[PDB]
Amino acid sequence: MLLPETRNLLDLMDAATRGGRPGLDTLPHAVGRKAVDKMSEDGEADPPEVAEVANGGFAGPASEIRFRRYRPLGEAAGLLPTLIYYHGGGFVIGNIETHDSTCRRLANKSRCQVISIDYRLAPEHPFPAPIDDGIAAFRHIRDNAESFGADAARLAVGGDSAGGAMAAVVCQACRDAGETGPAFQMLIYPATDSSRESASRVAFAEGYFLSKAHMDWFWEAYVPEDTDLTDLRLSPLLATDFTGLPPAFVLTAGYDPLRDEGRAYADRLIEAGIKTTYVNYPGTIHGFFSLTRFLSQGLKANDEAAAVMGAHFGT
Amino acid sequence: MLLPETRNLLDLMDAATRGGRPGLDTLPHAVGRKAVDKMSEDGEADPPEVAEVANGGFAGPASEIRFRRYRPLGEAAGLLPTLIYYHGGGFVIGNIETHDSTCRRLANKSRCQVISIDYRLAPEHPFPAPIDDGIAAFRHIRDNAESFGADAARLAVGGDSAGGAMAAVVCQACRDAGETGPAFQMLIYPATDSSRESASRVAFAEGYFLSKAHMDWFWEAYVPEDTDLTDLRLSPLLATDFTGLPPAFVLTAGYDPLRDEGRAYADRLIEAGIKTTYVNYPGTIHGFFSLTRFLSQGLKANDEAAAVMGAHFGT
Ligand SMILES: *[P@@](=O)(CCCCCC)Oc1cccnc1-c1ncccc1O
Numbered sequence: 001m002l003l004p005e006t007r008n009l010l011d012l013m014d015a016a017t018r019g020g021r022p023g024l025d026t027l028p029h030a031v032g033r034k035a036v037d038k039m040s041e042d043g044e045a046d047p048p049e050v051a052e053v054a055n056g057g058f059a060g061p062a063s064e065i066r067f068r069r070y071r072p073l074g075e076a077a078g079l080l081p082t083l084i085y086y087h088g089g090g091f092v093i094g095n096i097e098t099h100d101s102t103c104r105r106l107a108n109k110s111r112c113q114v115i116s117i118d119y120r121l122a123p124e125h126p127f128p129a130p131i132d133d134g135i136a137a138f139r140h141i142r143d144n145a146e147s148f149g150a151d152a153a154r155l156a157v158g159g160d161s162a163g164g165a166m167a168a169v170v171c172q173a174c175r176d177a178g179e180t181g182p183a184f185q186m187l188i189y190p191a192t193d194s195s196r197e198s199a200s201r202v203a204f205a206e207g208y209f210l211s212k213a214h215m216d217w218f219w220e221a222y223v224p225e226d227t228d229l230t231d232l233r234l235s236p237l238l239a240t241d242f243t244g245l246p247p248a249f250v251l252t253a254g255y256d257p258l259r260d261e262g263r264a265y266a267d268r269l270i271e272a273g274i275k276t277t278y279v280n281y282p283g284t285i286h287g288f289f290s291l292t293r294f295l296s297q298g299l300k301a302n303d304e305a306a307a308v309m310g311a312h313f314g315t
Numbered sequence: 316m317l318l319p320e321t322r323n324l325l326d327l328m329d330a331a332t333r334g335g336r337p338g339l340d341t342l343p344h345a346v347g348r349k350a351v352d353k354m355s356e357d358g359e360a361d362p363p364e365v366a367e368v369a370n371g372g373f374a375g376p377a378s379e380i381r382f383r384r385y386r387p388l389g390e391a392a393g394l395l396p397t398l399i400y401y402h403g404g405g406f407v408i409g410n411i412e413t414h415d416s417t418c419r420r421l422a423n424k425s426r427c428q429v430i431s432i433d434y435r436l437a438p439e440h441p442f443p444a445p446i447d448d449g450i451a452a453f454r455h456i457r458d459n460a461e462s463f464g465a466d467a468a469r470l471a472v473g474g475d476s477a478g479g480a481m482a483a484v485v486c487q488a489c490r491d492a493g494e495t496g497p498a499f500q501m502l503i504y505p506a507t508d509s510s511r512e513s514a515s516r517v518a519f520a521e522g523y524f525l526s527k528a529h530m531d532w533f534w535e536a537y538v539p540e541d542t543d544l545t546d547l548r549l550s551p552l553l554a555t556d557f558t559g560l561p562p563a564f565v566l567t568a569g570y571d572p573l574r575d576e577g578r579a580y581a582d583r584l585i586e587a588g589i590k591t592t593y594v595n596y597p598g599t600i601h602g603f604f605s606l607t608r609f610l611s612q613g614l615k616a617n618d619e620a621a622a623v624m625g626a627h628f629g630t
């Protein structure tokens with residue numbers, strides 16, 4: 001069932017709870033963010049060297065959107081294939097600094113450029129603000145490819161949990177509005193359905209790092225009181241038509257509330273005739289893709305994600 | 316639906332049929348083999364350079380089994396991670412020379428050693444002869460790892476169509492007999508069920524390179540008249556228990572009679588808690604993995620398979 005390394009980390013977390021570490025769901029949103037942001041930074045493996053890191057901003061829909069570009073070791077070409085990466089944290093926590101090590105590694109193994117986006121967070125900017133920025137970021141980089149050292153032909157989106165949701169909504173938004181969408185979508189244990197509780201959401205609601213308590217706390221902040229839970233920007237799995245979506249890589253963990261909706265999305269793409277890789281990492285938890293200081297499986301996962309995307313773009 | 320490159324190749328094949336090229340199913344097995352073996356060789360992309368090719372043999376269960384080792388460019392280590400590769404051809408056609416380009420490329424992209432096996436073919440050696448060699452080959456290389464420059468910890472099996480079937484049976488055989496099986500299984504559009512006709516087997520029985528006519532012609536030669544079609548060496552999908560099988564990569568083509576049984580096997584592994592990558596290449600046909608002179612998708616497929624296996628073994 002659980003890998004030894006996964007069991008060991010859940011035990012260390014339980015030890016810290018009994019030790020007197022507060023629950024994230026007990027703190028106010030702004031205070032809990034600062035606290036968890038430092039713990040996330042410290043859970044990622046030591047950041048590898050890349051060719052070049054660039055830090056900048058551009059005009060968003062209703063604020064400045066900050067980004068970080070990562071140029072991989074050994075790639076001298078001007079315009080590189082590019083992954084636009086949306087960090088996770090339930091549209092409330094996380095930022096560019098929390099997913100830095102992961103992004104550096106993706107860049108090096110894929111031989112692609114990675115552009116990490118810093119979208120607006122709830123509760124200060126609730127739904128639909130974080131998705132509006134993610135879409136604004138894709139459009140800005142698509143239409144200014146050369147500014148970002150990006151090859152417009154080979155421009156990909158991706159992310160983890162809420163960032164995975166964001167990546168999936170960006171493709172659906174671009175398809176539904178008739179414009180040029182990404183060339184590839186990388187969904188790391190994404191959130192694709194708010195309308196229903198799957199078997200995994202019920203089964204792994206307690207004691208597997210991402211709990212129901214956490215998900216309610218994010219929900220409190222992200223969603224204005226009376227919203228249709230079946231809105232495709234909250235629940236992209238309920239989309240009517242999956243044709244004309246870009247080729248997809250989808251990853252799930254075994255002990256992740258989100259496993260079943262992750263795999264359902266993959267099934268919807270496969271049956272609609274979209275080129276699609278699907279991988280399940282059983283015996284590990286939500287977060288493992290960036291908990292790489294404690295979880296070796298996370299590093300192997302980054303490498304599988306990077307490798308598949310390099311194979312698609314011929315890097 | 317069909318990619319332009321797939322449509323173009325099926326049209327050239329149809330042109331040659333109307334042109335007066337005989338059907339493979341009309342020729343005797345030995346004559347058809349010689350004819351198709353030269354066409355296969357000529358359908359593979361130009362063979363890349365590798366560090367070193369070794370050609371040799373060893374004592375099989377009831378004959379000499381020939382093998383070819385491919386050491387990849389840039390890998391100086393004595394003992395490498397190793398893929399034991401079983402060519403396809405319905406246990407009747409194919410050999411080391413037909414899958415040479417593919418094997419060289421897998422070796423280079425994966426950073427792994429590849430060992431191509433030359434197993435006994437039907438009708439001269441019918442069922443269960445080709446599987447007996449495949450199993451004998453794995454055991455010989457496992458128990459003489461250093462002789463073959465193989466790291467025993469990281470010793471993988473794989474193959475395409477009949478070779479895919481063989482790879483899957485080798486893992487089931489090693490599990491059922493209680494011994495140390497492969498550490499990874501790479502199934503390229505494998506044959507996993509003889510007991511039933513799926514939707515894909517009926518839908519793509521005519522006009523997609525691999526036809527029912529071809530499959531009956533292989534079957535005529537491979538299977539002695541009265542065999543239980545539900546024998547796990549013919550139908551490894553009907554296995555009762557999938558626990559204790561190695562992590563798997565499984566690849567299917569959209570227009571492949573074998574798609575549905577390929578995907579079913581993947582589903583069985585995922586539900587049993589085996590780490591498992593599943594990829595569908597829609598808009599291309601059975602054989603595309605080695606028809607790489609005409610089909611660019613085949614080259615992208617080799618790279619995805621190589622990349623996933625490199626990520627697993629940390630090459
Ligand atoms: P994701 O954004 C999960 C939220 C899905 C529900 C949509 C409203 O959360 C992540 C992602 C990556 C790494 N960590 C976390 C995380 N860490 C600590 C506590 C909670 C979460 O969600």
Ligand SMILES: *[P@@](=O)(CCCCCC)Oc1cccnc1-c1ncccc1O
Pocket residue numbers: 339351403404405406475476477478506525529530533534537602605
């Ligand atoms: P595979 O071994 C398909 C046979 C599955 C049925 C089991 C008895 O056939 C292949 C594999 C790779 C490349 N080519 C071919 C092939 N080429 C030409 C004609 C027929 C076939 O099967």
